[PDB]
Amino acid sequence: PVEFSRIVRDVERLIAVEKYSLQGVVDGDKLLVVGFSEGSVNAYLYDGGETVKLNREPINSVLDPHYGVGRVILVRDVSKGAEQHALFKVNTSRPGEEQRLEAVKPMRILSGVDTGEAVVFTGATEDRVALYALDGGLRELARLPGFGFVSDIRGDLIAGLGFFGGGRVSLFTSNLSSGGLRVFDSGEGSFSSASISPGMKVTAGLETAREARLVTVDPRDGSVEDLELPSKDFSSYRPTAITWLGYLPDGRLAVVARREGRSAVFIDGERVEAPQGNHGRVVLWRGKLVTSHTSLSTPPRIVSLPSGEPLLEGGLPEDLRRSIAGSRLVWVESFDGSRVPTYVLESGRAPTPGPTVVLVHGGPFAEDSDSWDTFAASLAAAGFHVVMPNYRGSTGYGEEWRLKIIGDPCGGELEDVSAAARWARESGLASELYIMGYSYGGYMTLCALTMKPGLFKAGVAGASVVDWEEMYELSDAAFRNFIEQLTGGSREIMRSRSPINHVDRIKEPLALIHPQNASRTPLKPLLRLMGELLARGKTFEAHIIPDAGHAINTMEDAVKILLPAVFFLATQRERR
Amino acid sequence: PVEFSRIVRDVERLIAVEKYSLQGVVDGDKLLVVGFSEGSVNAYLYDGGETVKLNREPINSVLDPHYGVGRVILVRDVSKGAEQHALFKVNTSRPGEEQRLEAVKPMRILSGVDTGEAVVFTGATEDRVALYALDGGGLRELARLPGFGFVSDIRGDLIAGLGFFGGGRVSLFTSNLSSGGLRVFDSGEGSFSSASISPGMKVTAGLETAREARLVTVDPRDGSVEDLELPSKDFSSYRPTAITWLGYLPDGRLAVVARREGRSAVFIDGERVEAPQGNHGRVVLWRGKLVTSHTSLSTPPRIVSLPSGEPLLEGGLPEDLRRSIAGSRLVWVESFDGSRVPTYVLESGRAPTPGPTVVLVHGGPFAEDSDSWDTFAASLAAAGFHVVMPNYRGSTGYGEEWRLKIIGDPCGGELEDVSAAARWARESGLASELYIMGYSYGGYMTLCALTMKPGLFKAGVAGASVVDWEEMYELSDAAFRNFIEQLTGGSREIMRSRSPINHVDRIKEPLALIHPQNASRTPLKPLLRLMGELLARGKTFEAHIIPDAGHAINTMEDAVKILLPAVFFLATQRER
């Protein structure tokens, strides 16, 4: 008999843990860290093993400080839950006292750095996106041709990143005193990060269709060339993504790069030991390195390097923490000999072999990595091993692997998902196999239960795609484009790869979780799918909920969209 | 912000409390009680202080013992909840040791009584219902019955019982233990409800009518009936409408438990004995004193000593939860036509006065809200809601006239009654906000109220609701179709105009639908169409469609499926 209250209690703890993020170093060597709990945000000083809350009421975020500045600039929603924001200054010697910056009209704050003498940010208004600087008074440094974000300032030079068309992130620069704008593209791909050398070049991370590298950009003559670093651990790591980079007050370049779902920290190209997982920015604090850290078993936290010992971390009970027994990355051989990179979270509450869920990510253009995942942790806590396959279409493994999905939905990617199920059983992890996913994952659950009955014992399909053909006609102009690219632009492909048209072949119980009022995950198709299931003798359950929303941060969100899935699987587990 | 885990925890305690029932006196003057917890049944000797568990693995029930027998006959499902039972003997001197009564083929055991020497019972096989006897000489069919039948008492060779032998009433039957046969008597006034055999070997039965109930003696030889005069007149003055149970105690005095207006009363030889307010079960003489079982809207079933009302056996609820369910009373609500609607109220110790109140409408419609333990009402009170339970016209328990007013007027008079109770809630100063919630005919009432009377309730929960009468006929079985034509007068104008699917436009409040996926008498197709109408007409709702909803809530799983969605939804509306 399922332990309903124990599951709810555990899920709540998992939702409620403080998660931390690192923002910089202010005042007299204090960490500026942001703390989240159920997506309520607050800003804190950390030094000498104590914290002090900077804000009063919750905020949205904080603008990046230069090292040492004696104030923090809070960013907060003007009306309740809206896209509009106000800016509020807090002196780090007077924590809790907020002065609104009346010179900023309410607007959508996109990014910002505070030099201590000027606050430079990007915002979007009814009509436009701009680069502002505030001190003098307010000032428009440049109108931007699209959403854009400030990466760093040094002296007068300002460096940033922008979605200015072409399908790729451009680098831009401005000047603090003379304003103006200058945009740099890379044919190869996208700029992902930027910081300004002491020699007044812009060091940037360039992601490509294969591997990432560091370029140097001379802002005055437009010239680019590759940056060679004294130590070569960085080029030898062969990264596919560059999360963040920045020059430290001593002059050294800190870089955090990624490969295969995890990241690594470099200083002037030299690797520095960090706990396994994913990292955020790196700062120099009291002479040592500090960074944030997350993983499939660790909510986001602030650790020191290279000991990896935490400074600030959320609390979980030890049984519950033991229930998440370890995660490895494994490469699963699929139908065509391609290897599917797949994260596995083993559960401390299941035997080996034991109950396993293939938890299929959404998108499809997204990535299962070694980062904290509420769903995965909740399943582990409920006695399920969790298998997370990066099916073709996923991001994080190069452009080639992402593009194989184009024109073959419910084709190659499904074989990948399937290959992971099979690997689960054959390695002797899995005794029983279940499938569960939201968005494109829901679609995969529906495809698997129709195109491959007998593989999974039951499935959970949330926010699933049901019929591609129908979904176009009841869709907006932008999403419609998306659907035609993904389907090659053919009715035979949209019809044959929609699982509503294959409902007859189902032989396993299905759980449907769906929003009642999302325009891009529409209800009318689901109604029809339920009609087909009823009319054809198939057994299922359904939960239709308003304001499903985007992600899960609060316990309410979990009760609506996560607990039905976990309860259904726990119940099926006793039907063996 | 809703306290989800506190609700789940409270509800689980409420589902899990041992609920007691009294069966008889066995052994050396020990009580035989059966205990229910999470739909698990066990049998116990109580003899002052500690209980002793007679069975091993759970059971389904026990057959009724004569005073003093030194054994107990357990009845248990032989298969996985098929209605296939075997009988098991336990000597009272040696609890936990079972001997299976192998002479009896597995069959549906409907009832039994054990004299110490013979075990006499009825059961239902593939083809028939019979009356069996089992002694040292083997098993014998005494009589095959014309319908479902139940043994009530034995004395010497004379067996009395009760049976659904047609004519839309319950008949009295007798047999002989030695020579079998069958005799069947019935009344043009109504139904027999209970039987016991007098010292002189006449059958005393309780006869329920279109109005008031009375005690009769039947001479099983002439078929001659007459009224039983008792020596105290309390019983006739009490003017009962139902007789739950009656029995002759070892001293020859007649105990009778009788009901009027949602509550019952104990009588010994006509004389009323003081008892805790609510409803009571059988009555016995234990160690020279009176003992009976007791339940109310604020007390789970328990064993109590009379006349003090001190509890002998009773389940522990924690103190906070205990206080949340703060007392019930009965009130008479004036309705649209001057008729008074008898209405139970359970106030919450977690609500102010005035405060959030749910009008919790009973199913049926031929059923009754009495002062008896109700998991739904108790959960709502635990979650901070006052609960109003109105016996709308159509209800049973208040005479045949009040039950028949619903015939040909669904979503008519009865709805005004439900509505009247809402209004009384506010006007008396109980309610600050009003909600409606019901299952079966109660779901229909929620749907009717939200369409025919928007602005009255702030939100509603409609579970297992009737949606469209017209459609429900065409997809219903022969017996249920009859029911629908009676209830609707046999007119298409009435079936169409009183189905709330046809009035979906007038809804202005949030609706929660809970519904089974695979119940043939609460079919899904209509609900799917109702959702279509709500989507297509801008209306906001949630829905939960669950397989195997089943009939009642006994296990925590049942509550998770069908109760928690309601409570959670109502708690959320209470903040918005």
Ligand SMILES: [Cl-]
């Ligand atoms: Cl804190």
